[PDB]
From a paper:
The crystal structure of GraA was determined at 1.96 Å. The protein was completely traced and, in contrast to other antitoxins, does not contain an intrinsically unfolded domain. GraA forms a homo-dimer (from now on referred to as GraA2). The GraA monomer consists of one long and four short (2–3 turns) α-helices, of which helices α2 and α3 form a helix-turn-helix (HTH) motif. Helix α5 extends over seven turns to form a dimerization unit and its C-terminus (after a kink) also caps over the globular domain of the other monomer. The dimerization interface of GraA2 is mainly stabilized by hydrophobic interactions. The helix-turn-helix DNA binding motif, comprising residues from 25 to 45, presents a positively charged surface. The separation between the two HTH motifs in the dimer, measured as the distance between the centers of mass of both α3 helices, is 33.8 Å. The closest homolog with known structure for GraA is C. burnetti HigA (backbone root-mean-square deviation (RMSD) of 2.6 Å for residues 4–99 when superimposing monomers). In contrast with most antitoxins, GraA is a fully ordered protein and, in accordance with that, is also uncommonly stable and not degraded by Lon or Clp20.
Numbering used by the authors:
A (entry chain A): 4 to 99
B (entry chain D): 6 to 99
């Protein structure tokens, strides 16, 4: 298929939210961002930016790489799933 | 630590080394020459799609490029909005 893309919002929701019990608005206030931004990420609609990842790391006690690496892994897995065969068929390696 | 754009690594460690033109790279990548130039000139970032293309083309992993991009964006964010971020975020209370 292969392995399912994991949106950072899934981690935010399943591992942080489900346990700590915060609302979207509560998280937003602590992040210093607007609630709709948080709403987008939790619903896995919007990605995590460098600014957001820094905010999350302070707010939830993580590194900011944790979040951006989740984002790029998701984005890569998605690009592979969506465009992987087309890319493999159209790119030539360059050794000189 | 100041930021390193992935395009600098593409330009200095691959282009300068192997001596290809921007156009030759774009042809091999299956993309437009201005798309390559925007990275080489450090005006734009490397997307997942571009990272995949580069990885095939230059025998790298795609993560190699994305992690360079992630590092650049974080370092940049910290350098320009770090104080603003520290001043506006509170540890969430469980």
């Amino acid at each position: 298929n292969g392995m399912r893309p994991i949106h950072p919002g899934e981690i935010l929701r399943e591992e942080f939210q489900k346990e700590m019990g915060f609302s979207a608005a509560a998280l937003a206030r602590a992040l210093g961002v607007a609630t709709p931004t948080v709403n987008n990420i939790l619903r896995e609609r919007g990605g995590v930016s460098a600014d957001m990842a820094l905010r999350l790391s302070i707010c939830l006690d993580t590194t900011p790489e944790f979040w951006l690496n989740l984002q790029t892994a998701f984005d890569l897995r998605t690009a592979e799933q969506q465009h992987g065969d087309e890319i493999i068929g159209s790119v030539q390696r360059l050794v000189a």
